[PDB]
Subunit: 411 residues, 4 copies
Amino acid sequence: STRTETDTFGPIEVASDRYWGAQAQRSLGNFKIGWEKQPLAIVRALGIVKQAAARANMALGRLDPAIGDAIVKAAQEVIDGKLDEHFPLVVWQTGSGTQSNMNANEVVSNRAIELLGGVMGSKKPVHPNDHVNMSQSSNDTYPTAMHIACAERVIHDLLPALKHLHKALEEKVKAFDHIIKIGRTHTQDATPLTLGQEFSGYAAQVASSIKRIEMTLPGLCELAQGGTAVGTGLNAPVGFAEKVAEEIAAITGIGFTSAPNKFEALAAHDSMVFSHGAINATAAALFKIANDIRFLGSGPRSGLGELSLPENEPGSMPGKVNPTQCEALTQVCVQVFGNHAALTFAGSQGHFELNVYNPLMAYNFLQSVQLLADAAISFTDNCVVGIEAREDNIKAALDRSLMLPETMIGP
Amino acid sequence: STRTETDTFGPIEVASDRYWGAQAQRSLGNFKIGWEKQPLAIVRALGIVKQAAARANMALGRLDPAIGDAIVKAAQEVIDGKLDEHFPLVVWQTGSGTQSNMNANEVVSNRAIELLGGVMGSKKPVHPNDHVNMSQSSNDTYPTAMHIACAERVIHDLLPALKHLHKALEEKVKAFDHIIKIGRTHTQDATPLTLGQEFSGYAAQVASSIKRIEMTLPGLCELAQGGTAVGTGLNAPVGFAEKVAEEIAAITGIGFTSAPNKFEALAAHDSMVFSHGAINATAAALFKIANDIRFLGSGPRSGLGELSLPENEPKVNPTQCEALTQVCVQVFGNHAALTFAGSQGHFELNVYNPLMAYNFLQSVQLLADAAISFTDNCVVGIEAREDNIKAALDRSLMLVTALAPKIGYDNAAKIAKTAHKNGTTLREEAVGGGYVTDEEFDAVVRPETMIGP
Amino acid sequence: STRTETDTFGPIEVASDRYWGAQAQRSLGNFKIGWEKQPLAIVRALGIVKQAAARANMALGRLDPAIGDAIVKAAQEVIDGKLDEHFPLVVWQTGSGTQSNMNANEVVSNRAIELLGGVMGSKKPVHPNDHVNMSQSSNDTYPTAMHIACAERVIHDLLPALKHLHKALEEKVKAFDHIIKIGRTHTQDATPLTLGQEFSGYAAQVASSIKRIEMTLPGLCELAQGGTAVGTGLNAPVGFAEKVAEEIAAITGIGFTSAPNKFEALAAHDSMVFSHGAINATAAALFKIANDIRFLGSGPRSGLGELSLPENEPGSSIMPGKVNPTQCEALTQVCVQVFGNHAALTFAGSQGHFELNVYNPLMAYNFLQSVQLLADAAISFTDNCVVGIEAREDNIKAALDRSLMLVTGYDNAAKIAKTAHKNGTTLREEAVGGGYVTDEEFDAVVRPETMIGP
Amino acid sequence: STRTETDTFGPIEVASDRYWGAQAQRSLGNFKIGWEKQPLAIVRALGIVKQAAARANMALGRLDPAIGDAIVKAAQEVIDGKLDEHFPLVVWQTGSGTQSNMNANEVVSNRAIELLGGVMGSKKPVHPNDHVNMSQSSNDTYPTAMHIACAERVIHDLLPALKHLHKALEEKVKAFDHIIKIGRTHTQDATPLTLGQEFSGYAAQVASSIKRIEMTLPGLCELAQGGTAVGTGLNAPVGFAEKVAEEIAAITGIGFTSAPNKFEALAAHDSMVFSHGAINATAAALFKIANDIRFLGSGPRSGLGELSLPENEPGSKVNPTQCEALTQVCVQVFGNHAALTFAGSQGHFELNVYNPLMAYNFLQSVQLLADAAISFTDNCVVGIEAREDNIKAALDRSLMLVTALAPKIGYDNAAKIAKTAHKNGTTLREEAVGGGYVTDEEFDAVVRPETMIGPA
């Protein structure tokens, strides 16, 4: 059961229960590459831009409110994640993200047609290019969607995750502050510090990571939208760039702004390279914390034996508790280091007016953010909060140390 | 509706619909991290190990044929892709791959039980640990499945994909052999070469990439199975290591062997770092090829204008070039992750296995799929813009050297500078300056004699 | 001839005309690895720490001014770079930088001794450990010196080099604002923009890079000094951490502070990873700029032919066209080197163990190499390429009139396009020669200057 | 004083004691970038190419013996490392390596002129371009020199350094083969193995790395020389490509060959990406080995305490400083590999113009790994001693060996022994004998670590 959809290349059959159009159907056949569909955060962001564009185009007298209001309602369904199944395209597509931009135009158009009681696939009364794509190019819409999605996930997922981790580490600083243990430098026995003090290092690394990320957000919140095809703003109304950013800001509740220079915003994504550097630095910090905890929990008898980590999956030898949350997190952090290398290389590869590595950069950034937010929460809830000190082992080691104690942990 | 499954922690409910057990159900909650499930190639290879172990275990008299035969059939369904929906676990789990090993044990055990008309969840008469996992450990099974999957996907997907690309390139070598063009070095106009010669470079890069990959296969084909928990082989029967590798080889049609040192095989995965090194080098070659083609197709008026690339989407954007180059950069990133994970083994065991399996297999899948798509949707349909190329050939200043024999260096130089200043051709400055007749110009300046030694 | 020097391990011979002592001499023999000695910027920074520590120790009455004043003068010579030949140790040493710290203690001690008329090698009256290293550890001094060195080179070398390039780019924006050219998207012909607008993108990328770098400096300027061995501050006087940071700030003219958590400052160097992330992002920006200019200057006849780049290397008389974009090549090579350095530095940054990260020299070396190369290459690409760039106006205009992009009367706009495309002619030759519109109607309609803004 | 050297741009002064010419002198001011000069292995290799080219040109009758014999002797001094101070140019120059090729031409020409009693700077009777650079282009010469240098250093430095390390690891396999220790998986206590078995893993990692590197050498030994400017071989005599490769092979004693496709050899250096992938893999192996030894040596009292590593410097306790040097070096190689790979991707049309960058990173990787492998071997591995009393004492304290009682006393009674030992902080013996599950003699009869270290 199909309907026939058309574009400048000709007609193509689309499953009747699907909202997408000719171009999306073509891209399914042309880009059979890999496992990865466009991140759902990008799908949502494309919804935000189509909705904000409609609102700005109406306010600037370019769009019939009969058409515009239907676009707005249809795009809300994309925003709310109700139409996720109508985005079947892979990451590994045209480097400007044109196929997914057109996927969003077609879906918003067909759903709006349906809401107005029109015939799906006919492009009437809501046209995918003339109305949904009005005042925009793929060249400026996809990079805008990237920044929105990246900022949103950092602000709503990653930063709360890290604060949650920080709070748990601070609880441990307070609980472990009276526990005096032996320091290790070069892995060799050294002078004493409290377990609370050691944990205060971990906490400080996490707080610092939070601040580093936050500092990079203003860059991320500058949007390409309104630069159109090459950055000149040609074929956009005067004032569109500013207005559509205000509309985007109002939808998201995040202080998005129009980029001061559209040529810079199209030809390069240096803000994402720098923001991803803060996430890269966060991964190095979390790696170290997780690796330390791993080793401090080693044993029960031939290890360092300072920590008792919660046992999350079933045992049988007695006392043998694998630090599996440390393992999940350290694996995630290394993934991020790899993502950062790809993201950086892609960022260097812009040509003239346009960087055509957009889907790759969005996919790497969003994966890093998802992985680190998820693993930070999991490591916190399933490891950190339940960590106990093995005080007898810590005492018994200190009393059998060569290194020498309440008078040895101060300036 | 749910079935009660049990482990040493206690009972937990599993959808009656599902073949997995207590460990897998627990891991769903414990590792709520990311988008990525275990690659289906890893699921298949785990099926392969469990099938091969059951056969090895039966031939060594350790496993009763009533249990073993059911295991073999249940495992065959995993191998064949029929039970993919029964592996719901993420990549980002315990670093030995234990949870996915357990997932495989439970799925095979339950399906085996059902084949025997027993009660699922009861571990009778096919026990997930005692029978499906017999003579093995998570530590030696998951890295074995890693190597099987990596070698299988390279042999069946990547290698044929590159050969397909190589053939399509060699065809263009022959078709474009007669087309003389201006070379570019440092992006500046240079001495000539044929479009065929230029494409012979691309082909040779692909052909060399294949040989580099093939060379790393023997190392991938060495399997950790039989090292058990720490490499010693404790709790595996004498001969199990060798037998199970033979069984795997028979299942796959590929020359898998038992690794000569099981400690090296558990504590590190250097052969995967090396293989992916060949994949990384192939990504660099493919990137350069796609980037060249991208620029050679630039235009139609203000670019290089040498190639006409097929238009697939509704002035032709080189979208297949863009897909392939993005894929190659992804591989560069994957290689850094895989290398670092490789360095991070501790004592008897490397606990970055799922991360390494995921990266290696993603690279292989992307490179293979993009190579095929680049071949079919770009390379085969490439046309030379012969009028553009010839026009440029005639407007070039590079051919001045051919006049030097007959007219001397200083005169040729004077032709070139005047042509450069005036915006004119060499023929216009040579013939119109009296240095040579039009008959002699055509006799001296022969591009066909400047593309060889 | 050689002077006998002594540590807890035994006696060892040191060349008589050298100021280093027993631990330096041992490390020379023990670490025969690589081409790279410690960056001179680190040597300087070690001198700074020794000078500052002496002044901080005197102000807290732990060090006798007779000894202290000689240390200051000796350290000054290290700071001024007068004693660089007395630091023969490689980067590829102990991971805390212990041996370079000791190299600094031994050089400043022997020089101060020689300044007080004493006997070199005798540790009197200036002891390398008890006086020069007083109140400090290698674990807090080397990381302190790393941060001083990195911050000094970013502030004095890289940022001025970037401002210099930005200024030169802004002059080209003004000069090229009138020149309308064809845009390129996916490398395909696209709608018009001016060469000035294109260059304003480059200028904005550099300015943004400058801002990203500056924003990371406060983190770099937090110092580990005072944490001593494991971070607790043991064996350093109360108030030493604050005071020595104040002394370091006075010496360098830069607002260095004492790190609020010494455990974080010794066990990890996350703020270097973050700062180097700004440098990494700068290298990606510079890479794209240089690469664009390389392609825009390509030709003279079979390239893009938009820019004429200064020829800095001799050509042939028979090759009046060819100008290799060699400054572009130096810069792009440097940028790619920075991408590698960033990967190493990040990985090293993840590899701390318990109270101490022991990849310090690796990270110092990579960071400082990145700063040196980017600053140098930015200077050289500016003076030797950017300032001398000329637009090939006739070429750009000829390209603009041979273009098929200005088609956007009737609607054989597509048919004029497709015929010109088919025939290899111009839009004029088919729109006027085909009888669709006159020359004056063509010229009143097809206007690029109306197509470069909203 | 100075000598006037001239190119097409005009005259330039060169220090009288220096053999380089006009282009080398201009390159000093044009590329004031970085600390790094062209590696000396590249200088040597440029010497090799110039000597090989002279011999090849003479043999083909295109170069006068009076001129070439002088080039040959002058180039020999470059090859021997006698003229190193006359190559002052940085890595960070033109991407084809032109400036360094020119440097070699000028140095060879001026020294040759001198040997013939001519005037230095005159280009007579030996001309840097007409004679020393005959049949060559900078596009095909510098990458030939690059491959020569990389292969030479791998073959003479890195491979022997790795065999040296392997040899010292095998000594330790034999020494430690009697010593049974507790395994560690996930860093947790696990079943036993010998310290010899553990070192057998390290030794097999090193042997495997050796084979991986060797396998990539044929690729590295294929040379671009003869491709000239763009790959076609125009301006080179028929058979120059083959002959010059032969001459290079004869100078080096290494099986260099002429690359079967010159366009591939000029536009890309994928062979180097692949070989450096072998070096990258080696660094990952060596990092793991050194990191393990670091941790096994940890203590002396609150670490793992398995190994006593030689004390080279103060000190405290024994800081594992050789492990730190080697691990730092290994991470450096990971970074180099990323830069090298990306450069490899960046070729444009007929020529890759990231040559010096790739050369520099490859040779630095080789130098650092060879040096660090040797130093780690000599100053750490050979002197490593097992702390047998520590290891034995942990082996007897371990809960891991309960599994040996399981066949005799059953799987539930062994666990009861283990949990009680765990809770009480007592040994397996105290709980097994002291709970009447087994006699002292039976415990020694069944709980035998030496029977749990192999197939079962």
